[PDB]
Amino acid sequence: YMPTIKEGNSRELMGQQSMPNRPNYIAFRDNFIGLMYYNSTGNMGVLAGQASQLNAVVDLQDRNTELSYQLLLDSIGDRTRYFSMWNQAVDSYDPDVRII
Amino acid sequence: VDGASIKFDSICLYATFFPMAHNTASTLEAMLRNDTNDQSFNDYLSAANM
Amino acid sequence: PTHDVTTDRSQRLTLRFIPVDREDTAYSYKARFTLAVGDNRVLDMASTYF
Amino acid sequence: PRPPVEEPAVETVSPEGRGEKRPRPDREETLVT
């Protein structure tokens, strides 16, 4: 609440009131999504032999390697657990906030 | 716009090796170089994305 | 099991791989490695990471 | 305490008790290990 548009100190600016900023959590994504170029044919990765030089990674744009790895970790392991090495911490909203 | 910036110092590749016995890891090597012992994988999503 | 499981030679459990040709860009970063698997060894690529 | 085992000696892991998709709840039918 700014009472006065004018700069400088005044009696009216004793009534200005201060609100905390919104909490913003900036971090790497779950399982490091977004670091590695997957499914971009402009930035296709290479695993090949040094001599034959034919790339064994045939990568497609209508494949979703990130979501294939997100749904795989749900099936083979407990997904509520946290693993800091692969940054394996699943995005989870609060159930009291979503459904009031 | 909000001034976030990521930079990379150095990226190293690591690789952990099972210390298998030399004529056990050569018997496994010889078996896995057949065309009948090809390692076949499947994408878990297994879908085309439109 | 004692015999024919673990090698009796010297062998690193974990290796370190410096890039061969790295290339920096303002929008991306490329790193080219030599993933050299030595003889009488197998490498499961799940154990590899950056 | 120990996963199920067949005996052909050799000692072979038995696939019984594993989880499956069932149209009916699996506890009233089998023991799930």
């Binding site: 795989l72 | 056990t24 | 099991p1 | 050799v10 000692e11 072979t12 892991v13 038995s14 696939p15």
Partner: peptide, 29 residues
């Protein structure tokens, strides 16, 4: 028959199962 590579539970090797060699894991089926 590669049974000296298996851990001996007792006097017999604890071999795995034949049917566990493959995989059929796939999203939705």
């Amino acid at each position: 028959n590669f049974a000296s590579l298996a851990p001996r539970h007792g006097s017999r090797p604890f071999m795995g199962n034949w049917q566990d060699i493959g995989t059929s894991n796939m999203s939705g089926g």
